[PDB]
Design a protein around this ligand. Structure first.
Ligand SMILES: CCN(c1cc2oc(-c3ccc(F)cc3)c(C(=O)NC)c2cc1-c1cccc(C(=O)NC2(c3ncccn3)CC2)c1)S(C)(=O)=O
Length: 559
C-alpha cells in the first residue's frame, strides 16, 4: 500500500519559524540555514510511495529464530510514576490541559487523564488514535540545494506515558535478547570501535558494507508492525501489558489519521510513526530480521552485523571481488523484496576505515605511548553549522556532539573551546543542561564531562595526537566553508579558556586540565578520574538513545 495518503491540508508550524539567522555573530548569516514547515510538502512527496513485500523461507526462518529468542524474555509493566519520570521536562504538552511539568510532578489532572487513557487502551482495541504531524526545524550549512524539513508523527502526551507503561521494560530487554552482539545501542563509542576492530580481525579476509535503506520509516509495512507485535507477545508478559500492546499496535503503530497543528485532517499513515516509543526498537529489530534474511538469501559468508535503527553494517568473509559484488547485488534484491530498497546501492569495502554508518567513520590517531588509537568521527560541517546558529541565537546539539565525538580534533579544539568560553561568559557553568537527541533528551552538567568522556571513550580521549591528514583536511574545509576561525586560532583561544577554568578551581579546574591538556606546552600526566568509575549511564546504551521520548540522566552507583 501507499506509505501515506494526503488530504491537501498543509503541515503547519506551532511556533513562529526562521529560515535564516536575523542580522541582529552576523558573520554566519549567509552560511547557515534552518529547515521550516515551508519545505514540508517537498518531504511529504519524498516519503510517500507504494510498498510491495514478498517474503521467503530465509525471512521465515530468521523470524522463527527471533521469536524463540524473545520467548526467553520476561518483562513487566512500569508503574504510572516510573513512566512519568521517564518523560522529558519539555516533551510536547497534551491537548488535554497539562504538559510534561504536570506529568513529572504527578499532578491530579495529568495522573487522572493518563489513567483513563490506559483504561481506554484496555477496553478498546480498534478506534484509531489521532497523531500530530510536524515539520522539524533543523540547521545545516549552505552548500546540492537546501534540504527539506524532516517530518515527525506523534500521539498525545497521555498516550506517550501509556506506551512507556506497556513497552518501556521490553525496549530495555528484548533487542539484546534477540540480536545479541548485533544490537548496536548497547555499546559506548569505545566499545563500538573495539567490536568493529575485533569483527574485522576475526575474518580470514574481511569485506564490509553499510546498507542505506531509502526512507526506512516509509518502507515499514503494516505486516512488519503486526510482526513486531507478535515478537513482543513472544515475551513472558503480564496480561494487562499484552492487552495494551495489542491495542497500541492496532490503534496507533500499524497506522492512523494525522492532523496538522491547527487540528485539520492532514493525512493517513500506513507505515512507521516517527514519534512513538517503538520506533527505534521496531526499526532495529525489523532492519535486523530483513538484513539477516537477506544475508542468507544472498549467500553472505560468516556475516557479523551491527544494527542501530535503520543503520546497518555487515562485515563478512570476502569471496573474491566479483563474487562480493554479485553477493551484494543479491543482498540488495532480497532487501528490496522485503520492502527495504536502498538509497544508494551498497559497495564492498576492504578497509574498515572506508565504511560510513550513522554518518560516522573509524579513524586512527596516536596515544600517549605512540600507539594507535581508533575512534569514531564524522564530517563536522552540520555540528559546526548548528553551533554557529545556537551561538548567534540562544543555547543543545553542541553538548550531544561533545559527548559522542569527544576524541575528535574538531570537538577538542573547536566545540569544547567555544562552548566552555560561552558557559563562563554566561556564568551558568555548574548547571545541568538538557539536550535533545533523536527524539530523546539527556540531562548533563558540563562540569561532569571529564568523567562522562572517560567512561564512554577512555582516558585516551584527552591525550590523542597525530590525527590523520584526511581528518585534518576535512575539519579545515568545514571551518573554511562556514567562514569560521581556522584551527591555528583555536589553540590560543583554548589556552585562555583553560586559564579561566583552572582559576575557578574545583570541577571547573578538572575540565580545564583534562579537556584542554592538548593546548599547553608542559603537558600534565592525566590519571584515571575516580568519578568515572561510579557513573551509572545504563539507559544511554539502549534503543532509548535513538528515540521514544525518553529522559536520560547521569546517575552515580555506590561501589
Ligand atoms: C551517533 C553517533 N555515534 C555512532 C557512531 C556509529 O558508527 C557506526 C559505524 C561506523 C562505521 C562502521 F564501519 C560501522 C559502524 C555505528 C553503528 O553502530 N552502525 C551500525 C554508530 C552508532 C553510533 C550511535 C548511534 C545511536 C546512538 C549512539 C549513542 O547513544 N551515542 C552516545 C550518546 N549519544 C547521545 C547522548 C549521549 N551519549 C555516546 C553514547 C551512538 S557515536 C560517535 O556517538 O558512537
Amino acid at each position: 500500500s501507499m506509505s501515506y495518503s494526503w488530504t491537501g491540508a498543509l503541515i503547519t508550524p506551532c511556533s513562529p519559524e526562521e529560515e535564516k539567522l536575523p542580522i541582529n555573530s552576523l558573520r554566519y548569516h549567509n552560511k547557515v540555514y534552518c529547515t521550516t514547515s515551508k519545505s514540508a510538502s517537498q518531504r511529504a512527496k519524498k516519503v510517500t510511495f507504494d510498498r510491495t513485500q514478498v517474503l521467503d523461507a530465509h525471512y521465515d526462518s530468521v523470524l522463527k529464530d527471533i521469536k524463540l529468542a524473545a520467548s526467553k524474555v520476561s518483562a513487566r509493566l512500569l508503574t504510572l510514576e516510573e513512566a512519568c519520570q521517564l518523560t522529558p521536562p519539555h516533551s510536547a504538552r497534551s491537548k488535554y490541559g497539562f504538559g510534561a511539568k504536570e506529568v513529572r510532578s504527578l499532578s491530579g489532572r495529568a495522573v487522572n487523564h493518563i489513567k483513563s487513557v490506559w483504561k481506554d487502551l484496555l477496553e478498546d482495541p480498534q478506534t484509531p488514535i489521532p497523531t500530530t504531524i510536524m515539520a522539524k526545524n533543523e540547521v545545516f550549512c549552505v552548500d546540492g540545494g537546501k534540504k527539506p524539513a524532516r517530518l515527525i508523527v506523534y500521539p498525545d502526551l497521555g498516550v506517550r506515558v501509556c506506551e512507556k507503561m506497556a513497552l518501556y521494560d521490553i525496549t530495555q530487554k528484548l533487542p539484546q535478547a534477540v540480536m545479541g552482539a548485533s544490537y548496536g545501542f548497547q555499546y559506548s563509542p569505545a566499545q563500538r570501535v573495539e567490536y568493529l576492530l575485533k569483527a574485522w580481525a576475526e575474518k580470514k579476509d574481511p569485506m564490509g558494507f553499510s546498507y542505506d535503506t531509502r526512507c526506512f520509516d516509509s518502507t515499514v509495512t503494516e505486516r512488519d508492525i503486526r510482526t513486531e507485535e507478535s515478537i513482543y507477545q513472544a515475551c513472558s508478559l503480564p496480561e494487562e501489558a499484552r492487552t495494551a500492546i495489542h491495542s497500541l499496535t492496532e490503534r496507533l503503530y500499524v497506522g492512523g489519521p494525522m492532523f496538522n497543528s491547527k487540528g485539520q485532517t492532514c493525512g493517513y499513515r500506513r507505515c512507521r510513526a516517527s514519534g512513538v516509543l517503538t520506533t527505534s526498537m521496531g526499526n532495529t529489530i525489523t532492519c535486523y530480521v530483513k538484513a539477516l534474511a537477506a544475508c542468507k538469501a544472498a549467500g553472505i559468508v560468516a556475516p557479523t552485523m551491527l544494527v542501530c535503527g535503520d543503520d546497518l553494517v555487515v562485515i563478512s568473509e570476502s569471496q573474491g571481488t566479483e563474487e562480493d559484488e554479485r553477493n551484494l547485488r543479491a543482498f540488495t534484491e532480497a532487501m528490496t523484496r522485503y520492502s527495504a530498497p536502498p538509497g544508494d546501492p551498497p559497495r564492498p569495502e576492504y578497509d574498515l576505515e572506508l565504511i560510513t554508518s550513522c554518518s560516522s567513520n573509524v579513524s586512527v590517531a596516536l596515544g600517549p605511548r605512540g600507539r594507535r588509537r581508533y575512534y569514531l568521527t564524522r564530517d563536522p560541517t552540520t555540528p559546526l553549522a548548528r553551533a554557529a546558529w545556537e551561538t548567534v541565537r540562544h543555547s543543545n546539539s553542541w553538548l550531544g556532539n561533545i559527548i559522542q565525538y569527544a576524541p575528535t580534533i574538531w570537538v577538542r579544539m573547536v566545540l569544547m573551546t567555544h562552548f566552555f568560553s560561552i558557559l563562563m561568559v554566561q556564568d551558568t557553568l555548574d548547571q545541568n543542561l538538557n539536550f535533545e537527541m533523536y527524539g530523546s533528551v539527556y540531562s548533563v552538567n558540563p562540569l561532569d564531562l571529564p568523567a562522562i568522556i572517560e567512561r564512554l571513550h577512555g582516558l585516551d580521549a584527552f591525550s590523542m595526537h597525530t590525527y590523520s591528514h584526511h581528518e585534518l583536511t576535512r575539519v579545515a574545509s568545514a571551518l573554511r566553508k562556514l567562514g569560521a576561525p581556522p584551527l591555528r586560532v583555536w589553540k590560543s583561544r583554548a589556552r585562555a579558556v583553560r586559564a579561566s577554568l583552572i582559576s575557578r578551581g574545583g570541577k571547573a579546574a578538572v575540565c580545564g586540565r583534562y579537556l584542554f591538556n592538548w593546548a599547553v606546552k608542559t603537558k600534565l600526566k592525566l590519571t584515571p578520574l575516580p568519578e568515572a568509575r561510579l557513573l551509572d549511564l545504563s539507559s544511554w546504551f539502549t534503543v532509548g538513545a535513538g528515540g521514544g521520548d525518553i529522559f536520560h540522566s547521569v546517575s552515580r552507583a555506590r561501589p
